[PDB]
Amino acid sequence: GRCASSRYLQVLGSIHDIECGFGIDNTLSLNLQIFTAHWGHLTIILIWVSSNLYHIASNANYSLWVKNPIPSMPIAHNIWDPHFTNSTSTPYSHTIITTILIAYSGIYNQLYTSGFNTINQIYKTTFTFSCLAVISILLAKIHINTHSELLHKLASHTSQIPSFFQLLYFLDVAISSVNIRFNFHTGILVGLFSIGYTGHLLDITIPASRAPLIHTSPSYLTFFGGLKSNTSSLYLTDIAHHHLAIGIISILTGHLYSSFRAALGTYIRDILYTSHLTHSIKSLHLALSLILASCTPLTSTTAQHIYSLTPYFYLSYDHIYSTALYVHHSYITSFLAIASHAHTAITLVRDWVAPLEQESSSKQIRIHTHKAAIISHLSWVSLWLGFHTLAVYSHNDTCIAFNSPSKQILIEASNGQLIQQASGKALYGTINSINNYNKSFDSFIHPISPGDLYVHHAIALGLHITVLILLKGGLEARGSKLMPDKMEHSFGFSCDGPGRGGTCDISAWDSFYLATFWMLNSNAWISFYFHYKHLTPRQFSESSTYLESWFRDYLWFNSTPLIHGYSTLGANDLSVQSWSFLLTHLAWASGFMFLISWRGYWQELIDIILYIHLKTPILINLWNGDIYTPLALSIVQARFIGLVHFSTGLILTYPPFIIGATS
Amino acid sequence: YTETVADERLFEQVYLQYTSEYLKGPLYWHPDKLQGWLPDYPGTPMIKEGKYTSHVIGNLKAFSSNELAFLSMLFFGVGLYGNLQFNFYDPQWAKVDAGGFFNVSYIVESFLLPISFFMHIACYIQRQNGK
Amino acid sequence: RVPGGKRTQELGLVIPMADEDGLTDGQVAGLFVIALVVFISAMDLAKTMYNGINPAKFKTSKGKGYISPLVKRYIENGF
Amino acid sequence: KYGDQRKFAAVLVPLTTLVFPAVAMGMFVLYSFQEDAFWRIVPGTKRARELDEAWREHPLFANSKDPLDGLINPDDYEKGLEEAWERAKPAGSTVTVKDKLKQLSKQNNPHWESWRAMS
Amino acid sequence: SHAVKIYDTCIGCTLCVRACPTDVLEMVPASINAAKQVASSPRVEDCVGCKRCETACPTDFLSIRVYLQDNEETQYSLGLDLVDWS
Amino acid sequence: PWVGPKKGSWVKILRPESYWFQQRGQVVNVNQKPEVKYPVTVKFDSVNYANVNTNGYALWEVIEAPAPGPGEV
Amino acid sequence: VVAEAIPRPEDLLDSPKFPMFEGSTGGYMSRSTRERHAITWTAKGQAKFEMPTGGFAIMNQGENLCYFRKKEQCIALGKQLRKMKIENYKIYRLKKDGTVIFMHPADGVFPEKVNKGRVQVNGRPFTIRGNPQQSELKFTKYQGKGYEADPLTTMFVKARVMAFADVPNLFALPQPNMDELVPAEEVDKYTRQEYTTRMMEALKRVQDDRAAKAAKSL
Ligand code: CLA
Ligand code: CLA
Ligand code: CLA
Ligand SMILES: CC1=C(/C=C/C(C)=C/C=C/C(C)=C/C=C/C=C(C)/C=C/C=C(C)/C=C/C2=C(C)CCCC2(C)C)C(C)(C)CCC1
Ligand code: SF4
Ligand code: SF4
Fold it and tell me: Source organism's superkingdom (chain B) (predicted)?
């Protein structure tokens, strides 16, 4: 016997699930594979950085954008596509000149702020980052060899006593050690990296931004505030001082755990054992979940503070950079946030040992004892938020459709206004006690209106429901009342049969699949809020309390330039935006059939098609189907493929709209 | 005699009661019994008798309860003085804004408040153990 | 270029293009040499990851292995 | 001129987006018919057996798959268990610890990992 | 091939055996219930995985449990008709 | 000598995977054969997802709880 | 039980045992499949029935014989026949070589009827919840198959779960002395039974040292 066509999907669904590998027999192999994969991924990141730097160096106009950044537009890379018109000139080129694309990433402001002035510096930087990619791959090879050499040194290893087998658990102490990793991460990788970047700023960035000054004196460490007037960005001296302070704090903190000597520092196990934790820190899924849950606030605050307090030169002067960066980082942090819950569920399925029935000692145990209370209260708050946001929006829509704008229910956002007032009083007290006052903070505090209150309630509803689905999946991954053996099965499995009431979407993976739709919807709400307030603050402040305003004055109204891109009147430089808009609509709708239509129909359809192929004159004498038997996609594969189509469509439909509306 | 289900359950209970006691001993050697795993470090028991042992406070395990109480109250006074003399009374912000420097004594002292909190925690832990 | 979007037309935003080349062919070739080095090393790394660790090397491979003196300390310092 | 980099594009773009992808797809469909294909996720491949046996040949990982591995002195454990069962043996029960454990280890699951018979 | 396991809670319904569409299950004598019989799954290589046996089992939680193994599918566990894997 | 709870006596279910875990149900009958592993038969007012309101439990999964009372499972 | 001599369906064209059936495209796909399942039965009257592969059929008053690609179709037809009070039907799997394997009434008694000599295959001696946790059996014989564990392993891991919750009374495993142990494997003292005595004395020394160290500030 052999396999069917579903082998490809089955293999690719766990192609990186190194725990599911067949040759892997021990944590040594798993940890070494993960470490080597980390090295390869770092190489990929470095090559990507070098790629962007090269294309800015070669197929771009950094040397000219740096001179007049406010009205100029950067170039991403050239367009070489043989499908364009070999005659005339495309709307993306100045007549006979080559074809170009406008960069919406923001690397131009990054390099300008960091101190780049010439193309030659960018070329040297590209070369150095390619060198670093080589170094990373060679480090991967080095560590593979060192661990294989330890394994070979077990050919000259014996304790002369039966305790020699204890060495089995310490072979991967290089990777699995936690105290040393925490100490050196928090100290070196955070604090000293910040201190080195402060040195970079003081040596290059501040010297290459103003007239020549003293030999990088300590007057380069200022405490001004935000939004230097000329470049509309944070003071580079303030940034250097901030990185210096963070570096000092994290360097001091990095001396906490017992890393290299047994006589200094406290152990993480003893820290947890005397607190409300003591979790299984040897689980890789648990660590991954709680560090993905750490990159999530970091990325969300990155999205918030790149816009609110623009740190790069002339970044606020670009109407497309500011929206694209915020939306990108919001989507990245939403993905990481749902990742944290997905891997928490995988941790509970795979890497969690629980007491017999009643020992309420582990934190997961105490959570599982009253998990029903958690889920019931999360459902209650989700229901309240949904009911009272949709109902008030419906009131506003109905009363404004009935020619009565004054009959709306507009709750003044008093709590957010109080927080803003307190923060503004603090900031104004800071500013008034300065001999160099009249500072600006850009959008750190923004006008808050009833529309803001309603949108914040909608966002809270989305977050609550996403957390509800993910938390329910995590807590009932090991067993629910409907299926009280769920931890005997895989993390993702089809169903439990039509009996016992019917059990579609019962696995924890199915809970993740359901929660990804809500993650996408909440992110869409957040992005729509930001983009609408960005396009017209006045119209958002007044007419955003009724959903018809969102439907008309934002979606229908702002989609005018994009659809007009390519038509029977000529093309604009938004032609790619409109074409990708339609393509992403097609991708989004194509995944509906993988979600709505389920397997058996298609399996019968595939049986009919296979009947045809085994009935066609020439095919039957070459291919009997016994080798790679065509079969319909399995249930979990179908749900995942539909989810991928839906996610791709929903995500990639937005950047064309952003570019058409802002540019 | 035939092995009734009650007899099988009795064997289950006997086996579990014996083995759960045996595995705690020095003769099972499971990876969950390593240092940094569930069991306490050899010479440093953290929790015994449902009370924080003296080894919790690390290098302060040899300190007396009276010494820790005095250090806790002294550090609380000094740190609270530093915080109040840095924030509200004798503000340093205007002085440092015009090119001056912080009163370094205030900065050093203000870090003694959380130190005092944990010092009084350690004082209570020492008092519980009779040290 | 034929601009699209209201703001580009109503503000006069323009996209300057350098009349020079950017990078000469020699610089591109210099980058491609190191890119090829990355490529060869990455193919080797992919092979090694695909095949995984070989534990049976101690029966055939020469030498006797080695544990660095710090790795021993890290082993006996704890976990 | 601002062009003259298109001399690189006219070779690289057709190459890496047509020749390399087609060669990769052909090589992948060829690899799909090897006996080693997807040996890490597909059960019953020869290389998986060789890797498992190679792991078992290592002196550290000989008794690694045994769930009961760890008992430093299994004879002491068995003797203590037998002594504890003797004082709790119900009346004239005829079951010993040795055969009880022997029959509790031997289950009947013929269709478990039967895919270890082709490669 | 899937994995069909029978647990001690079986009460000799024979409903699981009757519901199986590929004769995977059978009744064997036993002494752990008033019916003096428990189910067995000697031929799970023919178990398609329809889980009708689980639908038919009336114990509080199923005395018969079918564990799906998709990376394990054989021609019999897939119900292949147009194609032979032998 | 009768073994297990009396007939018609309410018992609280201690089987963790049972649909009626920590619920209560009347004892229909208790099988007196020592060879039967799950002799206690309990019927419930609330049916499970299989629309079955009765199940057989082990001797160590019923604790002889009082009557449910008003508005109590 | 005596297996019949069911010939290969490609060599028994026009047999008197074949019931009168309409014939459809649902039959087994020749030119691509060589494994066929055959079901035979003896009827009393020519009662019309439904073929599992579409189309109806009329049995013969004597012997009957049908060929199908899948065992499921044969079992479906067997249930349909048994509803008509037709017992004594046998289902055979035909190998490509022509080998006849007797499948459905394997011991001659239908599986819903208890027959002596059968043994509970794939039986587990506990409630379904009694299976060991998947997390406990990582990188063992049952890496992701906790439901396949033998009951002894389930009891062992249950006892381990019971033990590894009384943290204060656990025994921390001593750290190996890598630098001064670990000679060449040929450098061993043999004396295996003495090695356990060395284990006993070394662990006694470790425990005494730990007790002495603990009795300093505790
Ligand atoms: C927009 C979304 C979308 C799309 C594209 C399809 C497409 C299809 N559905 Mg479908 N379906 C959808 C949504 C969609 N469905 C939804 C929401 C449901 C609700 C459950 C269903 C329910 C459904 C059922 C129940 C059935 C179908 C069927 C079909 C197929 C018949 C049409 C066909 O063969 O045209 C061809 C497919 C196209 C997409 C046309 C465009 C093809 C492109 C434009 C040309 C080729 C591109 C080119 C080669 C690029 C190469 C790729 C690139 C990587 C190089 C087809 C694959 C039927 C079927 O399969 O019967 C034959 C069928 O029975 N669908
Ligand atoms: C006797 C009626 C009754 C009572 C006292 C409660 C009480 C409660 N429900 Mg509830 N519920 C009910 C009926 C009832 N429910 C019905 C019929 C449904 C089906 C739609 C629900 C669906 C439901 C959900 C989905 C949730 C609750 C929740 C809750 C709790 C928080 C309060 C809340 O969310 O209310 C809001 C209640 C609703 C949104 C449901 C609609 C209210 C119905 C229509 C009232 C019907 C009353 C009935 C007709 C009275 C007839 C009297 C007459 C015969 C004499 C609380 C214990 C939440 C929870 O567990 O958090 C702790 C929660 O998440 N309920
Ligand atoms: C599930 C309930 C719930 C949730 C999750 C939120 C969530 C949120 N509210 Mg909010 N709010 C609620 C109910 C809720 N609200 C109710 C019932 C009212 C009264 C109409 C308000 C009035 C309100 C205002 C005026 C503002 C917010 C704001 C906010 C946001 C900032 C957090 C904050 O300060 O909230 C405060 C925390 C709460 C309100 C929690 C109270 C939860 C209780 C249980 C709700 C029921 C209370 C009950 C009706 C009181 C009856 C009194 C009666 C006996 C006399 C956040 C998204 C701010 C915002 O978005 O500004 C941008 C803001 O300015 N809320
Ligand atoms: C000889 C010479 C030359 C030539 C050169 C060449 C021919 C080049 C080419 C080059 C090339 C053609 C390159 C390419 C590259 C590519 C790359 C660089 C990629 C990479 C990737 C990576 C790195 C990643 C990877 C991975 C994956 C994805 C899978 C998994 C694993 C890993 C992670 C590894 C000249 C005359 C000029 C000069 C002189 C010298
Ligand atoms: S249906 Fe369930 S309880 Fe009845 S005989 Fe089959 S396995 Fe046993
Ligand atoms: S899943 Fe279906 S084929 Fe398998 S044993 Fe149960 S009833 Fe029979």
Answer: Eukaryota
Q: Which atom of ligand 4 is nearest to the CA of C49?
A: 31
At A629 the three-state DSSP class reads strand
**Cβ(E51) to ligand 6 under 6 A?**
yes
In eight-state DSSP terms, residue A233 is B
CB-neighbour burial class of residue A475 (10 A; exposed 0-12, middle 13-18, buried 19+): buried
> What is the Cα–Cα distance from A214 to A207, expressed in whole angstroms?
9
The answer to whether the CB of A191 falls within 8 A of the CB of A249 is yes
CB-based burial of residue C75 (10 Å sphere; 0-12 exposed, 13-18 middle, 19+ buried)? buried
Q: Phi and psi for G72 in degrees, rounded to 5?
A: -65, -40
Q: What length is written for chain B?
A: 131
Q: Which two tokens stand for residue B110?
A: 């203000």
Nearest to B118 by CA among B128, B130, B126, B129: B126
Q: Is A456 in the pocket of ligand 3 (CB under 6 A)?
A: yes
Amino acid at A223: F
Q: For ligand 4, is residue C13 a contact (CB within 6 Å)?
A: no
Q: Which helix (H) or strand (E) holds G36?
A: strand G36-42
Among A582, A593, A599, A610, name the best residue to mutate to test ligand 1's pocket (greatest count of ligand atoms within 8 A of Cβ).
A593
Residue identifier of the C-alpha nearest atom 21 of ligand 3 = A411
Residue B41 half-sphere exposure, CB side, CA atoms within 13 Å? Answer: 22
Distance from the Cα of C26 to chain A's closest Cα (Å) equals: 12
- Whether the CB-CB separation of F37 and F66 falls below 8 Å is answered with no
Closest CA to A144 of A35, A235, A42, A245: A35
Resolution in A: 3.0
* Cβ of residue G95 closer than 8 Å to a chain B Cβ: no
SS3 A183: helix
Beta-strand relationship, G36-42 and G63-68: antiparallel
- CB contact (8 A) between residue A631 and residue E78: yes
Q: Verify whether ligand 2 is closer than 6 Å to residue A379 (CB atom).
A: yes
β-sheet bridge partners, residue E37: E29
Identify which of A326, A69, A90, A558 has the alpha carbon closest to the alpha carbon of residue C7: A558
